[PDB]
Design a protein around this ligand. Structure first.
Ligand SMILES: Nc1nc2c(ncn2[C@@H]2O[C@H](CO)[C@@H](OP(=O)(O)O)[C@H]2O)c(=O)[nH]1
Ligand SMILES: [Ca+2]
Length: 104
C-alpha cells in the first residue's frame, strides 16, 4: 500500500522522509542541485491549504527511490518549510501545464 500516490507513483513514509532530509540539508547549507536549482522556493500559486506555515521549498522525490542528484527531476515533489516540517507531496502529473495537484 502507498502512503502517497502521485499518478502511478507509489511512495511510502520512508521515501518522503529520506527526500525531505536531503533537500532540507541543501537548504540549510545554501546549496542547490540540478539545472533547475533545487531546492527552491515554492510560492503556492495553487492555493493549497497546508497545515504548516510558509515559506515553502520544493524538492524532487524520485519514483526510483534514489535521492535527487541532477538530471530530470521527474514530476513529483515534496514541499517543506523553514522548520523542516512536511507541508505535502505534490505532482505535475494529471495537472494542467506546469501546475501541480496534491498526491493522494
Ligand atoms: N506551479 C507552481 N510552480 C511554482 C510555484 N512556486 C514556484 N514555482 C516554480 O515555477 C516552475 C513552473 O512550473 C515550477 O517548477 P518545477 O517543475 O521545477 O517544480 C516551480 O519550480 C508554485 O506555487 N506553483
Ligand atoms: Ca520506495
Amino acid at each position: 500500500a502507498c502512503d502517497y500516490t502521485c499518478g502511478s507513483n507509489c511512495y511510502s513514509s520512508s521515501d518522503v522522509s529520506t527526500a525531505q532530509a536531503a533537500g532540507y540539508k541543501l537548504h540549510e547549507d545554501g546549496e542547490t542541485v540540478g539545472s533547475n536549482s533545487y531546492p527552491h522556493k515554492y510560492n503556492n500559486y495553487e492555493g493549497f491549504d497546508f497545515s504548516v506555515s510558509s515559506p515553502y521549498y520544493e524538492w524532487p522525490i524520485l519514483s526510483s527511490g534514489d535521492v535527487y542528484s541532477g538530471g530530470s527531476p521527474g514530476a513529483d515533489r515534496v514541499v517543506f518549510n523553514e522548520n523542516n516540517q512536511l507541508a505535502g507531496v505534490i505532482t505535475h502529473t494529471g495537472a494542467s501545464g506546469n501546475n501541480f495537484v496534491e498526491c493522494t
